[PDB]
């Protein structure tokens, strides 16, 4: 497919994500308001640990195994969640008795297990994991498509499903190990995150970055040595891709959570271990996590002693334009 001239690159600071879903709502009200897209959350935020969206997506299959394209499953509709529908008119305006129940009977939804996580009180633990298309350097969706409908933009490395060229083969759905293409059953086309390329083209950050309320999102071109994404991925090396073992070389990276309280022992007193287990983070981000957390902890400790820490200042992001392409629009 050939490398892009520049690669739009995201960093998600899990020390700062508050799981408010504003980014989920922003993307949906901008790009996925059309026919057949009601169940599609190009941007979504899942509680970790949990089932995610679609449920059990992390064992769906796809990606590459020793360089070989894998064909995973196509998630059934119930794993995404049948989008609930409601009859407000009847009850509120038309004199109909009966509560305004959701249809269907609730059993699954994109955020079903919010704030449940794992562990028993007083060592329950969870955090938030925002997700979107990773605009991979090795896009499994792109290789899979038998109609070459998916392309990777030369100017910014954004991966896009060409809606005219798509014929509904759903190989992309099978092969993306992140489950981020969604098959639209009304139009018979896959739809997915477009990296907000219309905003990028006008020098405006994507909506899930510019509208991030927690101030946890970074974006830029990784070749820009003065960008926060460069500083976090390349210089300080505290931003890791999600599930590198899928072999797609994502271009969305995560700063793991070093904030958080200690495990509480039976006598009510703290352990040195965090409530967020390292084993969970290693499951998400691989064996480099330990070393990243150490860097982060060490740099935060400098700040606690009144000393300087350029890395902490990058994550703090006192000015949004030090974290991202201009968010103003």
């Amino acid at each position: 497919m050939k490398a892009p001239r520049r690669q739009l690159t995201y960093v998600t600071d899990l020390n700062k994500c508050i799981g408010c879903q504003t980014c989920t709502v922003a993307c949906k009200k901008l790009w996925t308001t059309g026919p057949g897209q009601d169940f599609m959350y190009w941007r979504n935020v899942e509680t970790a640990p949990g089932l995610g969206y679609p449920r059990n997506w992390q064992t769906k299959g796809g990606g590459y195994k020793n360089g070989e394209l894998q064909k995973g499953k196509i998630p059934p509709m119930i794993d995404y969640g049948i989008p609930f529908e409601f009859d407000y008119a009847g009850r509120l305006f038309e004199g109909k008795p009966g509560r305004v129940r959701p249809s269907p009977t609730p059993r699954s939804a994109p955020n079903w297990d919010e704030d449940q996580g794992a562990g028993e009180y007083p060592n329950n633990s969870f955090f938030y994991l925002p997700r979107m298309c990773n605009h991979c350097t090795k896009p499994a969706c792109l290789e899979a498509c038998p109609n070459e409908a998916i392309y990777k933009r030369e100017q910014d490395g954004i991966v896009v499903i060409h809606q005219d060229k798509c014929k509904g083969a759903q190989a992309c759905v099978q092969s993306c190990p992140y489950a981020k293409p969604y098959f639209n059953p009304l139009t018979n086309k896959a739809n997915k995150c477009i990296g907000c390329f219309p905003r990028i083209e006008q020098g405006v950050a994507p909506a899930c970055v510019a509208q991030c309320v927690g101030r946890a999102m970074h974006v830029g071109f990784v070749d820009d040595v003065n960008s926060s994404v460069y500083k976090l991925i390349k210089q300080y090396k505290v931003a890791l891709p999600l599930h590198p073992e899928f072999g797609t070389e994502p271009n969305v990276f995560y700063v793991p959570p070093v904030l958080g309280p200690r495990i509480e022992m039976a006598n009510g007193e703290p352990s040195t271990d965090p409530k967020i287990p390292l084993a969970q983070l290693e499951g998400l981000f691989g064996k480099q996590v330990r070393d990243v957390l150490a860097i982060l902890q060490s740099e935060r400790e400098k700040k606690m002693k009144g000393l300087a820490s350029d890395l902490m200042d990058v994550l703090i992001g006192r000015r949004s334009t030090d974290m991202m392409i201009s968010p103003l629009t």
Binding site: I18, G19, V25, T329
Partner: protein
């Protein structure tokens, strides 16, 4: 060639999705405290979406406020076009609540209302009419419309700050102020923050970044919450006490700090009443009238350790300023009229410890002790960490370590919220918090203090609001106190046996001695009720008493709304109000120091009108009705006010000057020192910072933190003592055992096993957005009540089962979410889902009575007097207890 890449032409499909022809300023006029600047994008006269405008000016060295926003705000336009929208005036044809309506013209609807209003004045009394519209800061012009209408016809207004439980009762008792708090950017100036009954990850969404940013910048944060709440996953330490036992925790921290001498003695001596001398015989403050002929009942003594003589402290209630100023609504009295340096400690050295003898007026010698000496002895006796650990379930070691850390880090701050403010005894708990803050001496310092956050209660330009809403003066306006009004007119059963707390006697005596109001006067029923900008019925405590007992007394109930909420569903007339993006209004909050606003992106949809225009239209039809009924002028003896209903519209608009919404908003800005000089056009372009604030200076580039006029400029606090007053030597406080801060165990009058928590959810703004389809799709399609697995499993309750919760007040049936982070012995139902949502019966308020704490009824003790939203009974509800069982009429299988 154009330079375009291979697929650039097809990509125009997506480029067209992000396009608009018009961009206007918008705001969400809801009680969220966000006051978040937004742009609204329209195309071909249709609003397409909104996005944070991200244009609050930054302050040096600290994170900017931008972008703010939240998940409700970025789908706010759903209420323009959704299935909930009121399009036309509606009149009930069925029973209240059925949703059977007939469409009516504005003329018929307003005439019906006008006819009933005149009749009610003529046949009964003007105070049989009332208008409930809360939180003026959210939308001050819209607020002022109904209040100005009530102002001129003699109808009474309501309170909201206390009725909601948000009023920091303990702060008004301690400080003599309505309330005040730092803006949230000041959190970044703290080294050590206690989040105490506050869940800002969910309930301060646009401001929560300052907390994680402060931590990455070296601050430590503690969360105190029984459940492992979403905010707690980021903090450095989690303290999880039993519900409502936080006072025991605070008093034991105070013990450790006093005993280990970690406090700021200079601050205590100067800024608090803790050196003031207390008679050992009567337990009251030694007063000048005890010692001297014609001496003041409102002047006191401390013992000056430098001279060995008693000295009268300056600035107390009996000490007048030489230059009296006008009253200020948020102060017990205008102590700003005193000169700078007035209460500076000079070379005084008030003793905090010791016993002393003094000679009264009738010769006899009395032992006096400083307040601090009394406090210290009681704390050593009763408030050890070991004793508090038994009550709270927090280890003594953890209590001690927290106390030491909080007193050692400088600056340290407490951030409190509904989890600590919505309890029967929250007043004495916040006094205890203020005691912790005074001991560490961080009040009035950046990054310090006791900072409360709740709703959108604070309009800095309050004088301009009062000018528009109550132009003839607040002293010429009827107010009820809504907690009392609801308790009495709904005939609530609070289940508190009078031999424990004689609530009835305190309340009746409060009213007959004029300390607290009762409306209507002479025992008349309320008859006409206007509700707008608040879902009064859905959110009301004691709701089952209200529906059964109060609602049927009302002959006419009018709801003005953008949507059919539950109150409107139970109303007689429903009038369509213009959406936030179809109107002009201001929008401000205590969390940041900038003025927000909304303006029309498009004209009001369907037949809707802005709230200002509705009450102007009603004014005209009231003139006409008064003429038909030959009742145009009448004497209102309470105010020596001959009202003229024939000129109501000119009264509403100042002879037409304020007939346009924008002029009403500009009138507010012009009539407050905090805003005079700001114009609507400026605010249309960019949010503007206030020019001044309330109890501190507002300095360029520096976050506001309150009370510096007392802490730094040494003006007296507006309390009886003239200090932060921890001794309240009033009979009712002695009766309740809280003359000093101490632990008061929660009310257990509900004889049922689970404590009922009703916290606020990230997925709605109160009842608004509860029914939003997108929000529900991001949950489980309806309301939720949370339970620990250790309680659910013995009851056979599975995740997402229906559960029934009940007590003597009512019952609710709601789907459960089992969450390991919930603490056994309590259930947590996100507050006030709409009654028409996915509930099989009732709602969160069915199980809540109205309860009145007698200390909140005191109105004759210096700075404790009734003034609307300044002091009054809190509508607490966290003491509620319920039982829970699986509902077995529907048990769906999971897959």
């Amino acid at each position: 060639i154009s330079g375009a890449f291979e697929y650039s032409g097809w990509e125009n499909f997506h480029r067209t999705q992000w396009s608009w022809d018009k961009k206007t300023r918008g705001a969400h006029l809801v009680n969220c405290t966000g006051a978040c600047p937004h742009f609204v994008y329209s195309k071909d006269g249709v609003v397409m979406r909104e996005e944070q405008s991200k244009d609050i000016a930054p302050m040096p060295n600290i994170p900017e406020y931008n972008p703010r926003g939240c998940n409700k705000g970025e789908c706010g336009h759903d209420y323009m076009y959704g299935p909930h929208r009121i399009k036309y005036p509606l009149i009930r044809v069925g029973e209240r609540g059925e949703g059977k309506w007939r469409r009516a013209t504005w003329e018929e609807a307003l005439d019906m209302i006008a006819d009933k209003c005149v009749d009610t004045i003529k046949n009964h009394a003007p105070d049989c009419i009332s208008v409930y519209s809360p939180v003026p800061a959210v939308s001050p012009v819209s607020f002022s419309a109904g209040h100005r209408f009530a102002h001129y016809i003699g109808a009474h207004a309501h309170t909201f700050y206390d009725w909601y439980g948000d009023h920091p009762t303990g702060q008004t008792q301690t400080c003599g102020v309505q309330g005040d708090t730092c803006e949230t950017a000041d959190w970044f100036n703290s080294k050590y923050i206690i989040l105490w009954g506050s869940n800002p990850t969910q309930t301060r969404i646009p401001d929560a970044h300052f907390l994680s940013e402060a931590q990455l910048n070296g601050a430590k944060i503690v969360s105190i919450s029984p459940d492992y709440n979403s905010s707690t996953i980021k903090v450095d330490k989690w303290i999880h006490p039993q519900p409502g036992t936080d006072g025991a925790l605070a008093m034991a921290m105070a013990h450790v700090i006093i005993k280990e001498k970690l406090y700021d003695a200079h601050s205590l001596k100067e800024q608090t009443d803790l050196s003031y001398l207390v008679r050992s015989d009567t337990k009251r403050f030694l007063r000048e009238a005890d010692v001297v002929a014609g001496g003041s009942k409102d002047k006191f003594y401390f013992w000056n350790a430098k001279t060995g003589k008693p000295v009268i402290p300056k600035g107390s209630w009996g000490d007048q300023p030489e230059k009296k100023g006008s009253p200020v609504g948020f102060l017990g009295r205008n102590t700003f009229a005193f000169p700078k340096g007035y209460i500076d400690l000079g070379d005084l050295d008030p003793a905090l410890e010791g016993k002393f003898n003094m000679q009264l007026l009738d010769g006899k010698t009395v032992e006096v002790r400083p307040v601090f000496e009394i406090l210290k002895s009681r704390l050593m006796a009763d408030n050890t960490p070991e004793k508090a650990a038994k009550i709270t379930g927090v280890t003594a070691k953890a209590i001690t370590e927290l106390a030491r850390e909080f007193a050692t880090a400088k600056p340290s701050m407490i951030i409190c919220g509904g989890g600590t403010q919505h309890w029967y005894y929250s007043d004495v708990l916040l006094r205890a918090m203020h005691l912790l803050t005074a001991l560490t001496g961080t009040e009035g310092t950046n990054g310090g203090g006791m900072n409360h956050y709740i709703g959108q209660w604070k309009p800095a330009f309050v004088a301009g609001l009062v000018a528009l809403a109550f132009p003839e003066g607040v002293n010429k306006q009827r107010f009820c106190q809504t907690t009392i009004w609801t308790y009495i007119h709904a005939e609530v059963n609070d289940e508190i046996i009078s031999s424990d707390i004689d609530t009835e006697k305190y309340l009746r005596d409060s009213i007959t001695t004029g300390q607290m109001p009762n409306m209507p006067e002479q025992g008349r029923d309320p008859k006409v009720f206007f509700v707008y900008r608040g879902n009064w019925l859905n959110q009301a405590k004691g709701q089952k008493y209200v529906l059964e007992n109060l609602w049927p007394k009302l002959e006419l109930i009018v709801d003005i709304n953008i949507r059919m909420d539950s109150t409107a569903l139970y109303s007689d007339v429903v009038l369509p109000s213009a959406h936030w993006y179809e109107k002009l209004d201001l929008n401000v909050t205590s969390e940041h120091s900038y003025i927000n606003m909304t303006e029309p992106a498009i004209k009001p949809m369907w037949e809707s009108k802005t709230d200002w225009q509705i009450f102007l239209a009603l004014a005209k039809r009231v003139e006409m009705a008064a003429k038909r009924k030959k009742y145009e002028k009448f004497n209102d003896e309470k105010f020596k006010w001959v009202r003229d209903l024939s000129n109501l519209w000119n009264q509403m608009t100042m002879d037409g000057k304020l007939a346009e919404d924008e002029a009403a908003a500009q009138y507010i800005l012009d009539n407050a020192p905090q805003s005079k000089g700001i114009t609507i056009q400026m605010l249309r372009e960019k949010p503007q910072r206030f020019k001044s604030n309330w109890t501190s200076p507002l300095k360029e580039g520096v976050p506001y933190t309150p009370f510096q006029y007392f802490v730094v400029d040494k003006k007296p606090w507006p309390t009886l003592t003239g200090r932060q007053q921890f001794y309240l030597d009033h009979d009712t406080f002695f009766d309740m055992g809280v003359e000093l801060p101490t632990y008061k165990a929660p009310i257990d009058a509900d004889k049922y096993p689970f404590r009922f928590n009703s916290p606020h959810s990230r997925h709605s703004v109160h009842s608004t957005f509860k029914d939003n389809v997108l929000m529900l799709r991001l949950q489980r399609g309806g309301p939720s009540i949370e339970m620990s697995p250790l309680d659910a499993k013995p009851l056979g309750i599975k995740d997402n089962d229906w559960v029934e919760a009940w007590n003597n007040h009512g019952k609710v049936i709601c789907r459960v979410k089992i969450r390991n982070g919930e603490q056994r012995g309590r259930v947590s139902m996100w507050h006030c889902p709409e009654l028409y949502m996915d509930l099989l019966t009732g709602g969160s308020q069915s199980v809540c009575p109205v309860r009145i704490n007698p200390t909140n009824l005191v109105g004759n003790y210096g700075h404790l007097f009734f003034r609307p939203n300044y002091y009054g009974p809190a509508g607490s509800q966290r003491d509620v207890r319920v039982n829970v069982k699986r509902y077995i009429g529907a048990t769906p299988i999971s897959f």
